Amino acid sequence: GANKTVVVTTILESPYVMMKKNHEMLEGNERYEGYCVDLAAEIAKHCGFKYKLTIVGDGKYGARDADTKIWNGMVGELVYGKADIAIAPLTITYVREEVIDFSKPFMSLGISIMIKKGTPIESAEDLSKQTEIAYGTLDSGSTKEFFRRSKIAVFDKMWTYMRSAEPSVFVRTTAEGVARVRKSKGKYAYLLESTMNEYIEQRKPCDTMKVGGNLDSKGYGIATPKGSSLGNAVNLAVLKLSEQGLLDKLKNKWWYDKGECGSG
Amino acid sequence: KTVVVTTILESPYVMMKKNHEMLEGNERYEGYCVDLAAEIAKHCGFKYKLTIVGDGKYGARDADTKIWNGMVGELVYGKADIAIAPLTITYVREEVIDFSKPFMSLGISIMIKKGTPIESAEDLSKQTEIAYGTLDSGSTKEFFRRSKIAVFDKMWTYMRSAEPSVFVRTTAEGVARVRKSKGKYAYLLESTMNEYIEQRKPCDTMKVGGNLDSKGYGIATPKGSSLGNAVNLAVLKLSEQGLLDKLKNKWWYDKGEC
Ligand SMILES: O=S1(=O)NCN(C2CC2)c2cc(CCc3ccc4c(c3)N(C3CC3)CNS4(=O)=O)ccc21
Ligand SMILES: N[C@@H](CCC(=O)O)C(=O)O
Ligand SMILES: N[C@@H](CCC(=O)O)C(=O)O
Ligand SMILES: [Cl-]
Ligand SMILES: [Cl-]
Ligand SMILES: [Cl-]
Ligand SMILES: [Cl-]
Ligand SMILES: [Cl-]
Ligand SMILES: [Cl-]
Ligand SMILES: [Cl-]
């Protein structure tokens, strides 16, 4: 019954968790900065526990293997007892809800389209009705699962192309997808979550943009293992910080307050 | 055995059908939350009976009595097994009842008569010609009372003591007040209901500015209820299948008079 340090699994994803400039001479949680770094501190204060930030070893959000049927990423860390809690841009999904707990959402997002400025694309329907511009998603994430399991005509049509496109249209990190859009002269569009799309749109060289409306509506939740006694208090902490307006303050802090692409 | 569902008459969520007087049971009602209750019950495999909350209130706790009214009280005191309604997820409610993951997004918004010289909550707080208020016994009123944000705290100080009362008992009452006040009244309501009214005749109201907060509606059950697990998974399933977006388009825009 003695108080133990809470093991927090997170992921290096800008601006949620980022290496500080002088990280090579810093230790522990001091190495990291970002939205989820500030959020982890706010949560820990309200719940009154100590915690250690740990980057997920495999750098994945969470997917279940078809053959082995074992969870990887931050989800696996919680399922197999490697971490006590996940504080990261982890999307709430049906399949994950069955195996882990999710607090009420702390941030909203929907799948969106990233294009290099000037690309003749305005919607997912435009992508599905053409072949000149390739497009893909992140691996081991909820966006890829959205298209694989979608029974909607446009989305089902897009998945049928992406799953067998050559060379692979999928990426293993968001930065990989951003670079692919930037160095493809408009011949590649990246399907990612609106939160990350809006952030990149505010970073140099300011050559990308979110186009069209979102394909779905969901949020990020603070995840814990099923039955964890921490879930109750953290859930109330999220709602408290939301009502106080802190969650709105943190987004502006890490998305627009230091936007490198103008004042607007 | 039959699940008692408490809901509230709020368009387009729950509405009396035409010729409802010769109908009985769940067939008397139509709307977004009526379809949602059917979708949820089908996925969880239970029978249910729709009942309008007796006091016609969403849910607030009396300061002295500490007694919950509205649909929240129905769940706390065992009068209903589940609430399927535009019930806002809030911190104070989370302490006393369970909430599924949200099934619809909303934020506090401003309703004005078209042409009113107002663009933000900050504009309202910095003037006195145009009155403004909220619904009683709801989450919007509680948001302003408990807010330490400068603009919202300033707005609450005015509304709590304005005469005549700027608060209303129903959404329809607030809509009417905006329409026949020649722009000297703005109504603070949730964006979902603001967007619906904006698409209804006489098309003389509009939603202005961004929302003041960001939250959602959740399917509510008593704390510890065994139903909470199945309904929560049902909501997420309907979300990923896209049926929640379908129902939204069905009851908000598919019949637009503006
Ligand atoms: O994956 S979901 O759970 N399932 C389905 N949907 C869709 C609507 C059908 C959504 C939608 C959202 C965004 C709207 C929303 C709802 C509730 C709350 C929000 C923001 N906040 C704000 C900080 C962001 C705080 N607490 S809160 O009051 O709970 C998030 C998660 C999901
Ligand atoms: N937030 C996603 C990862 C990013 C994406 O899939 O676009 C997840 O939890 O899997
Ligand atoms: N959805 C709101 C309605 C009343 C309000 O606008 O605050 C509630 O549950 O209280
Ligand atoms: Cl320890
Ligand atoms: Cl009605
Ligand atoms: Cl009638
Ligand atoms: Cl019936
Ligand atoms: Cl039934
Ligand atoms: Cl709240
Ligand atoms: Cl302030």
Short mmCIF file of N, CA and C in Angstrom, two decimals, chain A residues 92-95 97-98 102-105 108 146 151-152 215-217 226 232 235-237 239-240 242-245 248, chain B residues 89-91 94-95 99-102 105 142-143 146 149 212-214 223 229 232-234 236-237 239-242 245:
data_model
loop_
_atom_site.label_atom_id
_atom_site.label_comp_id
_atom_site.label_asym_id
_atom_site.label_seq_id
_atom_site.Cartn_x
_atom_site.Cartn_y
_atom_site.Cartn_z
N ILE A 92 -9.19 7.29 -28.58
CA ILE A 92 -10.21 6.40 -28.04
C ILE A 92 -10.85 5.62 -29.18
N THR A 93 -10.86 4.30 -29.07
CA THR A 93 -11.44 3.44 -30.08
C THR A 93 -12.18 2.29 -29.41
N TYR A 94 -13.09 1.67 -30.17
CA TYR A 94 -13.88 0.56 -29.65
C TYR A 94 -12.99 -0.61 -29.23
N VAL A 95 -12.08 -1.03 -30.12
CA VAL A 95 -11.26 -2.21 -29.84
C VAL A 95 -10.36 -1.96 -28.64
N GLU A 97 -11.06 0.21 -26.13
CA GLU A 97 -11.92 0.31 -24.96
C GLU A 97 -12.18 -1.07 -24.34
N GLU A 98 -12.16 -2.12 -25.16
CA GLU A 98 -12.41 -3.47 -24.66
C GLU A 98 -11.26 -3.98 -23.79
N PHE A 102 -10.29 4.22 -20.65
CA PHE A 102 -10.07 5.54 -21.22
C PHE A 102 -10.80 6.56 -20.37
N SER A 103 -10.09 7.59 -19.93
CA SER A 103 -10.75 8.72 -19.30
C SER A 103 -11.60 9.45 -20.33
N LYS A 104 -12.43 10.37 -19.84
CA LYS A 104 -13.12 11.26 -20.74
C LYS A 104 -12.09 12.03 -21.57
N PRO A 105 -12.41 12.37 -22.81
CA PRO A 105 -11.39 12.93 -23.71
C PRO A 105 -10.84 14.25 -23.20
N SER A 108 -9.82 16.98 -28.83
CA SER A 108 -10.64 16.55 -29.96
C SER A 108 -9.79 16.41 -31.21
N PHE A 146 -9.06 2.78 -39.10
CA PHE A 146 -10.30 3.40 -39.55
C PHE A 146 -10.61 3.01 -40.99
N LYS A 151 -16.83 0.54 -43.75
CA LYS A 151 -17.76 0.05 -44.75
C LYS A 151 -18.32 1.17 -45.62
N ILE A 152 -17.84 2.40 -45.43
CA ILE A 152 -18.26 3.52 -46.26
C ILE A 152 -17.60 3.42 -47.63
N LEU A 215 -12.88 13.45 -41.49
CA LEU A 215 -13.59 12.25 -41.89
C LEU A 215 -14.36 11.61 -40.75
N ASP A 216 -13.98 11.88 -39.50
CA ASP A 216 -14.68 11.36 -38.34
C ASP A 216 -14.48 12.32 -37.18
N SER A 217 -15.06 11.97 -36.03
CA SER A 217 -15.00 12.82 -34.84
C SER A 217 -14.73 11.95 -33.63
N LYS A 226 -7.29 -1.96 -17.42
CA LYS A 226 -8.66 -2.18 -16.99
C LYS A 226 -8.70 -2.49 -15.50
N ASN A 232 -10.17 6.40 -11.99
CA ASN A 232 -11.23 7.23 -11.43
C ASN A 232 -10.74 8.65 -11.19
N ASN A 235 -9.66 10.60 -14.42
CA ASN A 235 -10.82 10.99 -15.21
C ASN A 235 -11.40 12.30 -14.70
N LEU A 236 -11.59 12.41 -13.38
CA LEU A 236 -12.08 13.65 -12.80
C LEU A 236 -11.09 14.79 -13.01
N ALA A 237 -9.80 14.50 -13.01
CA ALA A 237 -8.80 15.54 -13.25
C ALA A 237 -8.95 16.12 -14.65
N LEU A 239 -11.65 16.31 -16.53
CA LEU A 239 -12.84 17.15 -16.58
C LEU A 239 -12.62 18.45 -15.83
N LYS A 240 -11.91 18.40 -14.70
CA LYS A 240 -11.60 19.61 -13.96
C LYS A 240 -10.76 20.57 -14.80
N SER A 242 -10.50 20.67 -17.93
CA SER A 242 -11.29 21.13 -19.06
C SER A 242 -12.19 22.30 -18.67
N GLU A 243 -12.90 22.16 -17.54
CA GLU A 243 -13.79 23.22 -17.10
C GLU A 243 -13.02 24.49 -16.77
N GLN A 244 -11.84 24.35 -16.16
CA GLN A 244 -11.03 25.50 -15.81
C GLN A 244 -10.45 26.21 -17.03
N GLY A 245 -10.50 25.58 -18.20
CA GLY A 245 -9.94 26.15 -19.41
C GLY A 245 -8.48 25.86 -19.63
N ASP A 248 -7.61 24.19 -23.00
CA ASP A 248 -7.60 25.15 -24.09
C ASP A 248 -6.32 25.99 -24.06
N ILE B 89 -21.75 16.20 -20.23
CA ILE B 89 -20.76 15.66 -19.30
C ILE B 89 -20.13 16.81 -18.54
N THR B 90 -20.16 16.73 -17.21
CA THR B 90 -19.58 17.76 -16.36
C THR B 90 -18.87 17.11 -15.18
N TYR B 91 -17.96 17.88 -14.57
CA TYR B 91 -17.20 17.38 -13.43
C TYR B 91 -18.12 17.01 -12.27
N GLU B 94 -20.11 13.93 -13.07
CA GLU B 94 -19.27 12.74 -13.11
C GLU B 94 -19.08 12.15 -11.71
N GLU B 95 -19.12 12.99 -10.68
CA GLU B 95 -18.93 12.50 -9.32
C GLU B 95 -20.09 11.64 -8.84
N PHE B 99 -20.91 8.22 -16.97
CA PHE B 99 -21.07 8.75 -18.31
C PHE B 99 -20.33 7.87 -19.30
N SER B 100 -21.03 7.43 -20.34
CA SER B 100 -20.36 6.77 -21.44
C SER B 100 -19.47 7.78 -22.17
N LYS B 101 -18.63 7.27 -23.06
CA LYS B 101 -17.90 8.16 -23.94
C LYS B 101 -18.89 9.00 -24.74
N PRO B 102 -18.53 10.24 -25.07
CA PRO B 102 -19.51 11.15 -25.66
C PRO B 102 -20.02 10.65 -27.01
N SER B 105 -20.78 16.25 -29.90
CA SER B 105 -19.96 17.37 -29.46
C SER B 105 -20.79 18.64 -29.39
N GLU B 142 -24.35 26.56 -14.79
CA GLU B 142 -23.32 26.15 -13.85
C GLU B 142 -21.93 26.53 -14.35
N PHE B 143 -21.73 26.52 -15.67
CA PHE B 143 -20.43 26.91 -16.22
C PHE B 143 -20.08 28.34 -15.84
N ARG B 146 -19.40 28.87 -11.82
CA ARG B 146 -18.17 28.32 -11.28
C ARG B 146 -16.92 28.78 -12.02
N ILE B 149 -12.72 32.48 -15.11
CA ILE B 149 -12.23 33.23 -16.26
C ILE B 149 -12.81 34.63 -16.20
N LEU B 212 -17.56 28.88 -26.32
CA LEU B 212 -16.87 29.27 -25.10
C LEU B 212 -16.15 28.11 -24.43
N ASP B 213 -16.57 26.87 -24.71
CA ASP B 213 -15.90 25.69 -24.17
C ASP B 213 -16.12 24.53 -25.14
N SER B 214 -15.58 23.37 -24.79
CA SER B 214 -15.67 22.18 -25.63
C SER B 214 -15.98 20.98 -24.75
N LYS B 223 -24.18 5.24 -10.82
CA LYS B 223 -22.84 4.75 -10.53
C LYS B 223 -22.87 3.27 -10.18
N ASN B 229 -21.25 -0.49 -19.01
CA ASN B 229 -20.23 -1.11 -19.85
C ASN B 229 -20.73 -1.32 -21.27
N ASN B 232 -21.54 2.00 -23.27
CA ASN B 232 -20.33 2.71 -23.66
C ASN B 232 -19.74 2.12 -24.93
N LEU B 233 -19.61 0.79 -24.98
CA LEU B 233 -19.12 0.15 -26.19
C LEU B 233 -20.08 0.35 -27.36
N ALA B 234 -21.38 0.42 -27.08
CA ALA B 234 -22.34 0.66 -28.15
C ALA B 234 -22.13 2.04 -28.77
N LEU B 236 -19.36 3.84 -28.93
CA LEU B 236 -18.15 3.86 -29.74
C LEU B 236 -18.36 3.10 -31.05
N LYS B 237 -19.09 1.99 -31.00
CA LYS B 237 -19.39 1.26 -32.23
C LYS B 237 -20.19 2.12 -33.20
N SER B 239 -20.29 5.23 -33.33
CA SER B 239 -19.43 6.32 -33.79
C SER B 239 -18.54 5.86 -34.94
N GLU B 240 -17.89 4.71 -34.78
CA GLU B 240 -16.95 4.25 -35.80
C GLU B 240 -17.67 3.77 -37.06
N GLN B 241 -18.90 3.26 -36.91
CA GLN B 241 -19.71 2.93 -38.08
C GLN B 241 -20.22 4.15 -38.81
N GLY B 242 -20.13 5.33 -38.20
CA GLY B 242 -20.62 6.55 -38.81
C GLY B 242 -22.09 6.84 -38.58
N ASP B 245 -22.91 10.32 -37.06
CA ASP B 245 -22.90 11.40 -38.04
C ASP B 245 -24.16 11.37 -38.90
#
